[PDB]
């Protein structure tokens, strides 16, 4: 028996009122599916939201433990297992996800196999085990039949684009998605709606449409209880203010950091952007990671040195970064720092070009401001933002 079923019986023998609470929470018409779920092994709810809503409402502190055990007992050929994979992937519960993937790829249900293979492409691409050309080839090799994995195959490319500073394709890929084509799985369609809200938030951030960025993050926040989506919504709102309002930027990052608490991966996004925010506004930084050999961390060490007038040491560290593999957006930042250190218009022009190439309309303001101060034609600088 799965741990969730044991706990619910324990709690229900003390309190028969819990049946109606769980029925309502689970979106059931009557208690009968819940009776069946408690008493007969392998009975799944029609919608996976039923079990998640119960676990979150009744056992908020034990969600991971109970859902891990529940998911890894599911028949992997079922709708329930396919929903559980989306749950696991959405939450970045990698140990649940990878175990589901591995057993779904091997099973005889063609849908479950398709879901397993496509989520696996996402996992491989995000870890750097494959590149984007291999990912695309693997999507083509899969001969995808479901509307949902057709959509997910677009989303996984969008996630990679965002992570690799290659923003131009994201709005194009977005136009290929139609969520109304997902018919059978309301749990998953709903999860995908939240995914799309957070993706759209980032798309508008990168287009310098800050009001729409904030609107879509707020939409995600209003309709989710998944830590991952809350974290990224507050992160993206914080970034929307990074050039315009120190206090609101910081506030949103501190909120998000509190939502991230106890997940180091999530916490790191906030520490990184707080590092950048404090450096950009010339404040004493408490957030920098001096031990990391990630280029973005090393960039913040350098920016701090620039604020501390240690230009010679900043330049020596920046030269070490020229040896490193960087994406186009990262190179925007690189050349902006180089410009601040050397006072060469050349470096600011390169910074502009890299931000154009990554289709970053937010960050491009940084080198543009410096070029304006160095006597470049303001009208031309304005035209570059169009």
């Amino acid at each position: 028996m799965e741990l969730i079923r044991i706990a619910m019986k324990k709690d229900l023998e003390n309190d028969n009122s819990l049946m109606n609470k769980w029925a309502t929470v689970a979106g059931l018409k009557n208690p009968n599916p819940l009776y069946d779920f408690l008493n007969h092994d392998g009975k799944t709810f029609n919608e996976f939201s039923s079990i998640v809503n119960i676990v979150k409402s009744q056992y908020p502190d034990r969600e991971y433990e109970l859902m891990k055990d529940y998911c890894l007992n599911l028949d992997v050929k079922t709708k329930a297992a396919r929903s559980a994979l989306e749950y696991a992937d959405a939450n970045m519960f990698f140990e649940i996800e990878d175990a589901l993937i591995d057993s779904m790829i091997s099973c005889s249900n063609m849908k479950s196999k398709e879901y397993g293979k496509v989520y696996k492409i996402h996992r491989e691409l995000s870890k750097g085990e494959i590149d984007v050309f291999e990912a695309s080839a693997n999507i083509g090799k899969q001969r995808i039949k479901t509307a949902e994995m057709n959509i997910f195959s677009k989303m996984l490319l969008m996630y990679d684009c965002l992570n690799k500073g290659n923003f131009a394709p994201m709005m194009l890929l977005f136009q290929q998605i139609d969520l109304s084509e997902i018919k059978e799985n309301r749990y998953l369609k709903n999860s995908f709606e939240t995914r799309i809200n957070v993706l759209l938030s980032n798309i508008y951030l990168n287009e310098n449409n800050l009001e729409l960025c904030r609107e879509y993050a707020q939409k995600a926040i209003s309709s989710t209880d998944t830590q991952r989506f809350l974290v990224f919504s507050y992160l993206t709102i914080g970034t929307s203010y990074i050039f315009s309002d120190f206090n609101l930027s910081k506030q949103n990052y501190l909120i998000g950091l509190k939502f991230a608490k106890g997940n180091p991966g999530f916490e790191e996004f906030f520490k990184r952007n707080l590092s950048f925010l404090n450096n950009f506004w010339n404040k004493e930084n408490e957030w920098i990671n001096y031990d990391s050999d990630a280029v973005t961390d090393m960039q913040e060490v350098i920016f701090e040195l620039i604020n501390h007038k240690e230009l010679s040491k900043a330049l020596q560290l920046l030269n070490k970064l020229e040896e490193r593999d960087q994406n186009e957006n990262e190179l925007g930042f690189h050349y902006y720092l180089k410009g601040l250190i050397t006072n060469e218009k050349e470096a600011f022009f390169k910074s502009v070009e890299y931000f154009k190439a990554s289709q970053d309309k937010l960050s491009i303001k940084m080198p543009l401001i410096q070029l304006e101060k160095m006597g470049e034609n303001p009208r031309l600088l304005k035209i570059i933002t169009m």
Partner: peptide, 6 residues
């Protein structure tokens, strides 16, 4: 630099 996620 700035990091992003969804």
């Amino acid at each position: 630099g700035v990091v992003r996620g969804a």
